[PDB]
Symmetry: C6
Subunit: 83 residues, 6 copies
């Protein structure tokens, strides 16, 4: 399903970074949502067109998208994805 982490720890960020591509990693709330891969890139492209949030895949098919940004924005994004 979907989940939002408000005010994540440094340790939480470290865990996520280990599970992201170097390109993304090198670049607050975090929204985590499980999506099939077409949806994943569709919704990530959305965010790249949107300021104020950053996106990345999380590894582990149906995979995980992580949305990093400000509390309002992250919530807005998770809402948009539910439609």
């Amino acid at each position: 399903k979907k989940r939002i982490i408000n005010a994540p720890t440094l340790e939480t960020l470290a865990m996520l970074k280990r599970r992201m591509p170097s390109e993304s990693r090198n670049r607050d709330a975090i929204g985590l949502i499980m999506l099939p891969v077409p949806d994943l890139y569709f919704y990530a492209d959305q965010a790249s067109k949107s300021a104020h949030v950053a996106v990345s895949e999380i590894f582990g098919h149906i995979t995980t998208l992580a949305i990093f940004g400000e509390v309002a924005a992250v919530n807005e994004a998770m809402r948009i994805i539910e439609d």
Copy 2:
């Protein structure tokens, strides 16, 4: 499950390029990418439909790492391809 990205970002293209073979990467600059169709297919279908697309002008195809096929090209062509694949 299928999805079409209209007018993809440069970052979107970068994300996809990271997830395709080095050999396929050049094919993106040889084609106008109005749209990207992403569809999850069993492997026999994948290569069947890729081959189709490779024969078609105006689109380029690549695997993305039941797996994912990406169809790059002009809006009409991408839409046509996704339609054909639904049949």
Copy 3:
């Protein structure tokens, strides 16, 4: 399921070669069929006893057999496998 590629592109061959063992790769229609592994080797052994087609596993359990040869032969093989 099963599928046959008539007159494959060079790019199509390149995609398949990336997904085959070095031994096979180093060695027109292409038949692609998804089989459990016992069936896979059973039906591939058949082809090795048969002239005019070549066989290989394709990676990605239930896996994929690829049958390379002449149009008649490939069709014949895909038919035999349906029984």
Copy 4:
């Protein structure tokens, strides 16, 4: 599916350490390990609940290689955490 190991062996700790990131390994000596809670979670839940635990005193969390979260700490804390996760 969840499980709590009360009063784990040194060998049990060794087995788990082998299956966690090198970075997490030190966190075990910074905390009294009366108990270990092991629960299998989808990844969004995993990081959600880890983050919770990392904010909580008396427990430490780590991934073990839908995946596995390990919660290390004092009996009360571990039990509380496993309870919260059931909700």
Copy 5:
């Protein structure tokens, strides 16, 4: 499910060793049982508290625990795990 190998061959031991961690490998009947990972470590910890049997994961989620020891002990352990 579960299975017990009485008086295993050297070849059987070799096959299992290939599929265990170096740490375990470096350390008769063999009980093999498929368990979810929480159960796995729970029941392995049990064995570490118990003399006369040794435990290890076998690789290949729901994974496999291997219990090495004397015939009585191995049987006792497989019984305990059924509860």
Copy 6:
């Protein structure tokens, strides 16, 4: 799902050898391979039945990379083994 290859090709043997451990590879020349039985088994069954076969004369066993066991030997022996495994 099970299958028996009667009178396998040299190429068939080559394909299987590529997919077994280097250690197992020699065992094929120590045994007359009239037939190869291939059966997909959960891992406890795999080692249980391998061990059986390793104790039996006239067959050799190996893993092929729920996984696959290959039973190499004489037609009678292979058939007997596949039968025993159905029980």
